[PDB]
Amino acid sequence: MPKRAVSPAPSENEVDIAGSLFAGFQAMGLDANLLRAIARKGFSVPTPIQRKTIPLILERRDVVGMARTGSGKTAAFVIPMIERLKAHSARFGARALVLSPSRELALQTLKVVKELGKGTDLKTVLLVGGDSLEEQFGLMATNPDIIIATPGRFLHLKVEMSLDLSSIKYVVFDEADRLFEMGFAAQLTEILHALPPSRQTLLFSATLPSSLVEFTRAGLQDPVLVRLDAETKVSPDLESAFFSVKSGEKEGALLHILYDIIKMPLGDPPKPTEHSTIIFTATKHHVEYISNLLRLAGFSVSYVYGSLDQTARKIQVDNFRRGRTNILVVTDVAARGIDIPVLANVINYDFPPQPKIFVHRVGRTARAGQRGWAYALVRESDLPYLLDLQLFLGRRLVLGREEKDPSFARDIVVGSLKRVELENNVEWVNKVLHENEDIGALKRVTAKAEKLYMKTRNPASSQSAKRAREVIVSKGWGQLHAIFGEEAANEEQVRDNLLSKITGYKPQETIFEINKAAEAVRSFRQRIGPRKSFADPEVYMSYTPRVKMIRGESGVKIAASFKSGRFEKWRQQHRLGRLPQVGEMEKANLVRNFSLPSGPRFKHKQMKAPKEADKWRDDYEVRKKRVAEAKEKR
Template sequence: MKVTQQLARTQELDGWVGYNDGGQKTWLDMNCREGSLLTDGDETSHVRTKHAEAQDGFGFDVADLLDGGEGEEDDGDEAFIALKQAAAFRKNTNLKGTTLKKGGGFQSMGLNGNLLRAITKKGFKVPTPIQRKTIPLILQRKDLLAMARTGSGKTAAFLIPMVQTLKAHSANMGARALILSPSRELAIQTLSVTKDFTRGTDLKTMLCVGGDSLNEQFANMSANPDIIIATPGRFLHLLVEMNLNVTGLSKMQYVVFDEADRLFEMGFAAQLEEILHSLPPTRQTLLFSATLPSSVTEFVRAGCQDPILIRLDADTKISPDLEAAVFSVKGAEKLGTLLHILHDVIKIPTGLPEGVTDLSENPSKKRKRGGADSSHEKQKTSPYATIVFTSTKHDVEFLQTMLTHAGFAVSYVYGSLDQTARKTQVENFRRGRSNILVVTDVAARGIDIPLLSNTINYSFPATPKLYVHRVGRVARAGMRGWAYSLVKDTDVPYLLDLQLFLSQKLILGKEGKGAPNYTTDMVVGAPVRSKVENYTEWLNKLLSDESDLAALQRVSEKAEKLYLKTRNSASSQSARRSREVVSSKGFFQVHPLYVASSHKRPSSRSAVPPRVGRTKRRKS
C-alpha cells in the first residue's frame, strides 16, 4: 500500500494530525516523541504522550483488560506503521540492488538481506498479524505486552527484530539478549527457531535449562554468548553460582518473557523479579502471552517502562480452522472410548510408521554429510499425529503402556521424566517415528509441531485457558485439525465454563437442525456404544493377563482421585446448569459426528486390536 497516495486528506486539530485512509482513522500526536499505541473498538489507533494515561502507570486500562475488554483489530495500526516506516524503508534494497517491496511483507520492514533469506528458508511469506504489529515497534525499542493465541507466530515476532538489532557477535563480554521460557520443551523449541534465524551470522546462542550439565552451562556462559534461552530456575541458579551481578549482565539489551502467563501460573514470579533486579534498567522488556492473568499486570507495572499493548486474543481464542467434538462417557467406558477414537474415528494404523524399524533408535545418530540438521528435517503431513492430554504422570505411564499393548507407536512426556528421555520422546514424535504422544500439561505449550492433526483431552482441563493452550497445538499455520474431549458427568461444570468462555452454542445429541458447525458450536454426544463395549471387553482381558499393567492402572486411579480433590472448582452457575445437561436426553444420544457417515457400514475389523504390525484394509 502506498501511503502517500492513499492519504485522502489531512487536517490539524489542537496539535493532532488526522489522516483519513480509506475509512480508517489514524491519529498521531506531533508534539510527542515517544508514546503508547492504543486501539479502540472503532478501529481507531492513537499515539498518546507517556503520562497522558491514568494513575496505574500503563498505557492502557488494566481493569478493562481483565474484564475482557475489546481487543484490537488486525489492520487497525497498518496505516500508522506504514507511515512511520515509509521514509526509512524507501531506500532499502535487496541483494540484487532492486527496491524492496512496500506491500506489508517482511521486505518492507527494513530487515537485512541475510535475515530475509533465513525467513524465506523458514517458509514464512507474509507476516502474521502479531508479527506485523510488533516487529516495527520492537525495532523502535519499545517495551511491549503482546497477546495473541497459541500458534499465531509470537516466537518469530520477537526473534526477527532481535536478530536484526544484534547483527553479529560482540567481542565485549556479556550476553545481550535473554529469553525466559516456562518449560524445557519450549526453550528447546525456541533455540531451534533462533538457530534458523541466525544462520549466516556469527551470533552465539546458549540453552540454559534444568536437567542439563551445570559444568557445561558454566563453560557455555564463559564463552560469551549473545543470546541466552533459559528457564527461570536454572538461569537464577547460574546467576548465583557464577556471581553474575548487575555488572556481569550490564550489556543486556533485551529480556523476553515467552508465554508470560504460563510463567506466573507455574509460580516463577519471585524468581522473575530477582532476575529483573540483576538486569540493567536500560533493557527492552517484551512480554508475549496467550492470556492475561492479573499477576502478569503486577509484573508489567514493575518491569516495563510505558509498555505498549498489542492484543489480538479477544476475538479469536482458538484457531478458526479447529474442529472440536465432545464425547459424553461413563467412568468404566473412558478407556474403551479412547481406543475407539484412535482406532475408528482418527483411524490410526497399528504398528510402526513406514520406514521405522525400531522406536528405541537414536533419531539423531545418523546424519548425511552436507545434509540438513536432523532437527530441521522437513516433516511429512500425517493425518494420524495425535497428542493425548492427561492429568498426572501416572496416567501417562499407564496409557503409554496400554496403547503400546494395543499395537500403537507411542511416545510420552511428563515433568519428572529424565531430560535426555524427554528429548528423545519428543523428537520421535516430531519426526513421525510415533503417531501418538501422551503427555501431561507440561507439553500444552512449547511443542511446536505444525503438522499435528489431532488432540484428545483424556482428562478434561480444569480451566478454559488450559483448554485453549492444549488445542493450540492443532490447526496451526493454516492447517485444519480436530480436538476430541472425553467428559464424565463430574466434568460437565467445567465444560459449561469453557462454553461460556468461547461463546459457543451448546448442542446436545440431535438437538441441532441440520449438520452442526464443529468450528463454532460445542457439540456433545455419546460414542457408538457397541464399539466402546468391544474395546472395553478387550481391555479387561488384557488387564487380567498383564499384572504389571493392572498395577499401573491402580496407581493411576489413585493419582486421579488426588488430582480431582485439588483441581479448581467450576463456577457455581455452571454447576447448577450441569444437572440439567446431564439429565437431558441429548447428553447420552449418539454424537452427530456419526450421522454423516451412518449410511456407511463400518469395516469388519476385529474388536481386539492387533499387537504388532500394520493392518491393511482390503478394497471392497
C-alpha cells in the same frame, strides 16, 4: 518411595487473556548485513509473530508476545537485538541480556543468534548450569555483548563478581511461563531490581499465568501485549462431538472412538499422517497408563509428559512429526512445550477446567482451511465445565438427538455411544487389567492421581452446576450420539422406551421394610417424600457484560547475597589484575589468556598418570615408559 514424591509434574496451565488489560524484511528496513544474514538463513517472509513484533521492538516498546513454540519467537527478538547493537563496543559492559528456562532452550537461542549474526562482531556468551564458574569468569573477562543465561546461574555469577548491569539496555524473558512453572519468580525479581530502569523489555510466551501477569505489571513500562487471531476464533472448520462416558467405561470409550469412530489402522504406519490423533490428558500417570494400554491394543503411540527426559521427548516428537507414530498423548504442559504440526484428529480424554485451555487444545487442529475433528469425553462431574465451555463459545447445546441433523461444527452436540461395542470394549479393558499386573498398577496410580487432581482442580460456577443438575435430570443426557445414524435411533428406540421406563422407577418400599431400623426407614420416607421480550432492545441496560531467600544450585537453602569470595580467589589463582571497569577498553592479553577453546566442547577432561610399573607385572617396561612419558608431560 518416589511415587508422588514431590507432586504431579504437570501441575496446571493457567491462562489469563484478561492480561489484555496491559493496554518483507527489506520493507521493514533492516541493515544490509542483517538482510544478507537472513537471506542466508532462508527466512524469506517473517512469521506472523515476527511481523507484529519486530516493528514494535524497533520502535523501542516493551512487549509481551503470545505465540506458540516454533512460531519463530527466537528470531523475533534476536533480529531487533542485532539491529540495535550492530557492532561490538570497545567500552566494557554488555547491553544484551536474555533469560531462558533450560540449557537446551539456551543452546537453541545460541544457535539462532549465531546463525543470524554470522559476520557481525557481536560477542555472545552462554551462562547455564553444568559449566565451570571459572570459565564463565573468563567469558565475562572477554566482555561479551549478548548474554544468554539461565537465571539461577545468572545470580550466582552476579553475586560472585558484583557485576554492574547498568549498561544493559535490552532485556528478554524467553518462555517466562516455564520460568514461573519451574519457580524462578524471586530470583527473577532480584534480577529486575538489579537491572537499570532505562531498558527495553521483551517477554515471549505461549501462556499468561496470573503470576506472570503480575510480574509484567510490576516490571514492564507500558507493555503493548501482542497476540494473533487464531487464539480466539475456534476455526469454524473444526467439527466437535462430546461423549457422555462413565468412569469404568472411560478407556473402553476411548478405544471405540479410535476403532469405530475414527477407523484407526493398527500396527506401524507403512509430515503427519492422514489420521494424526492427539490425546490430551490430565496427568503424566494417565499419560503412561493410556500409552501402555494403547500400545497393548496395538496402536502406534508416542507419549510426551511434563518431566520427561530431553532426549526421550525429542525422539518421540521427531517420530510423531515424521509419521512413525500416529497417536500422540500429552497432558497440557508437554503439549505447550512441543511444537505440534497440523493435526486432523484431537481427542480430549479428561475435560479441561478452563474453556480457554479447551480452545488452545482444539486450535491445535483445523488450521489453514483444513477440516479438523475434535472428540471430547465428558463425565457427569465434568458436565459443569462443559457448560462453562458452552458459555465461553456462545454456541447452542444439543443433547442426544433433540435435532435430526445437528451441525457438530457449530453446535455443541453431546451423546452416548454404541452400547453393544462399548460393552465389548469395556470387557476387553477389564480382561487386560485382570491379566497384566503392570497395567493394573498403572491404573491404581492413575486412580490416586485422579483423586488428587479432582481435589486440586479449580471449581466451576454455581449456575453451571445448577443447569448441569437440570441436564442430568433431563432426557438429553442418556441417548446415543447424533453421528451414529437415524436407523440406530430407530432400533435404540425400539426398546429404549421400556428400558427408560424401568430405569425411572420409584420403589414403593425398600427391601429393609420388605424393628427399630425399619421404623427409622419408614419415618425417613415419610419425612422426605416428594414436596407438594417485553423490553425495548434499543436501551435496556443488561446484566451480563455486553535476609531475602533464593534457592541455590545445590538445592540446599542459601541466603540471597552470599559472596563466597571464590572469584577473588580465582583472581589470586591466575595472578590476574583488576577487572576492566565498565567503559574501559577490553584488554587483549586477558582476552588471549582466557578467550575460548578451539571449537567443539568436550566434557571428558582427566589426565591421570598411570600407576608405578611393577617388575612382576607383565607389561613392566611398557608401564615404566608410559610413567616416564607422564612425568615428562607433567
